[PDB]
From a paper:
The C-domain shares structural similarities with class C β-lactamases, including a common catalytic nucleophilic serine.
In the present paper, we discuss the structure of one of these polyglycine hydrolases from F. vanettenii. Fvan-cmp consists of two distinct domains, the N- and C-domains, that are connected by a linker. The Fvan-cmp N-domain (residues 13–262) consists of four loops, five α-helices and 15 β-strands assembled into a distinct tertiary fold. The Fvan-cmp C-domain (residues 271–616) consists of seven α-helices and one antiparallel β-sheet and resembles a β-lactamase fold. Fvan-cmp shares the same nucleophilic serine found within this motif. Fvan-cmp lacks this glycine and instead contains a phenylalanine in the same structural position. We showed that Fvan-cmp retains two of the three conserved β-lactamase motifs and the core active-site αβα fold but lacks the associated activity.
Author numbering: 13 to 616
Write the structure that this text describes.
Amino acid sequence: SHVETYYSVDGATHAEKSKALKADGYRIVSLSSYGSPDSANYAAIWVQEEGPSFEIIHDADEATYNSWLQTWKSRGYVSTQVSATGPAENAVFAGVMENINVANWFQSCELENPWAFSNTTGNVDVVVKGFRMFGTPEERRYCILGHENVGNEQTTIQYSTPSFTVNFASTFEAETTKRFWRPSRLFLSEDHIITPSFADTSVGKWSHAVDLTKAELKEKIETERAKGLYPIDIQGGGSGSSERFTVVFAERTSPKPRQWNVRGEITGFEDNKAAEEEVDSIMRRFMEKNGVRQAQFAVALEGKTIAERSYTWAEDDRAIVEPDDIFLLASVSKMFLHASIDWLVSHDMLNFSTPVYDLLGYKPADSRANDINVQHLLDHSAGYDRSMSGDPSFMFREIAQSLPTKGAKAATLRDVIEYVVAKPLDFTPGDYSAYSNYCPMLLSYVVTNITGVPYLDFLEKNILDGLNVRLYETAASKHTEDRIVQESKNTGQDPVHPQSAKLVPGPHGGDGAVKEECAGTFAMAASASSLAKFIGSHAVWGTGGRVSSNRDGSLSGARAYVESRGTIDWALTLNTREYISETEFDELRWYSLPDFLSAFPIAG
Ligand SMILES: *[C@@H]1O[C@H](CO)[C@@H](O[C@@H]2O[C@H](CO)[C@@H](O[C@@H]3O[C@H](CO)[C@@H](O)[C@H](O[C@H]4O[C@H](CO)[C@@H](O)[C@H](O)[C@@H]4O)[C@@H]3O)[C@H](O)[C@H]2NC(C)=O)[C@H](O)[C@H]1NC(C)=O
Ligand SMILES: *[C@@H]1O[C@H](CO)[C@@H](O[C@@H]2O[C@H](CO)[C@@H](O)[C@H](O)[C@H]2NC(C)=O)[C@H](O)[C@H]1NC(C)=O
């Protein structure tokens, strides 16, 4: 639990301190090598706790390191730290091998490009555990070490190549704007380039400093120690006068464990308690394997909830999901648009046959766009193929920049429509269907245009019948204390501030959508229960009353599924789409949960 740190020590001092700390029940959790290969310096962190046997090496040339690596590999040991300093031909190496059980690990110190590490790892997702960009600027070499990502941990590392240098301040700001995201390591090269790695695991309060002299580091370590933060990473770079340090501090030595929580009741089943045990077992296996933190399952019969199970597999700093919490619905949002158009047609305010752009007063660049009717947009047969021409729903930034205001103002729904009506169709209306986010955007504008009511107002008054279905607002700052965390590793350029260079999280504009203009297509949020209830009297797919079909949505931060099968309706919400693969999700929604509904009947 006690944390011992040293930095700016030579091989001989490292070896003395190592032998004494180890003999007094410490294990090495961080090793950095830096400086000149003829006089390398070391920074190390040691934690006083029990654990498996380990081996360390330092001042090792390539031959000695590879021989020692291969030797301890052959004895079941696993590389957990790797560092190198100097020109390729002349480099010295340091490392830690541990007697741990890791299925698959990978390491190369011969990479000339860090992106080449994927060829080493094949089809296996890894968490990078060790790194050093060594060599020289003209002849760059990389040590990269990765462990198989058991638990599907969410991580990033931003590499610098001979042809691109990471701006550390802007990367650090972008990555830590994502909720719970924190530095794991701040790797540092001899030419003072930071290669930072991030995680959304929790070590309590944390802090960091970069570009520190040993004097500044010593002060910073004392400052943080008084506050009860201890070093979890330390990295040196440079020799002599230009020696500098990165450091990350945390309250804890290791990530908090996740804890399992379930809320809600199954009420309308033959054997309610045996139904809970089985579906809990299914969801628990899925969430543990895929590292999913927050999820909901719900069954409804004729618009009435007969089952709700809300699931948390999360550290104690994530809210415990309840059945009435709301999840970003992504393209499940579309069934509310279909219901809105159904309302307008059956109240004689619109026809399936109504030509849309003539109704709006637009003169398309494509004569064929004059034939696009309400039905074409419901069916996605209107002529918009995003595989050919890209997806307008994620082009708000590029669209705003094309305006006369030249990116000073965010693009509106109307701006996207005007942009699209001035571009050709990809195909003749009605020839085939191509799944389109844009088609229900244009129909959401038609709803406002015909009624003079904002789409959200129209939904509350005439469609939702008091269901808590809400716009998921774009801005990250509106979501910083939300119970439900919409999780993505991803960041992108900001469509709300189209002249800003600063990357925003994927669920908060990073994916390229302004959610305020996408209520009709994927920007709504609701409970699984609200979904299961709604599809009881509305088409889950297509337009009209209840049908036997299903609908899903995928955005950065969200996965949702709803299905009407037989007499009942069921829904599933996840706080992520970054589960392991589609095959994990498809198995859950197409075998596991349907096979549960078969094996556990509703009340007789
Ligand atoms: C249904 O959708 C259509 C298509 O979007 C929409 O028609 C558009 O309405 C706007 C008004 O909101 C029209 O824009 C006007 O165009 C005239 C010239 O033709 C301009 O001079 C107008 O300027 C006024 O407004 C400006 C902005 O506040 C001010 O800068 C200025 O001082 C003026 O007061 C104005 O821009 C637009 O031409 C149509 N577009 C088409 C293709 O018809 C329609 O209003 C929607 N209907 C409903 C009921 O919502
Ligand atoms: C929906 O369809 C009906 C029937 O085609 C349309 O009603 C017609 O409107 C046009 C234009 O004003 C008239 O010339 C016809 O005489 C109307 N027919 C009838 C039977 O009333 C209606 O305009 C369409 N709605 C929309 C919004 O396009």
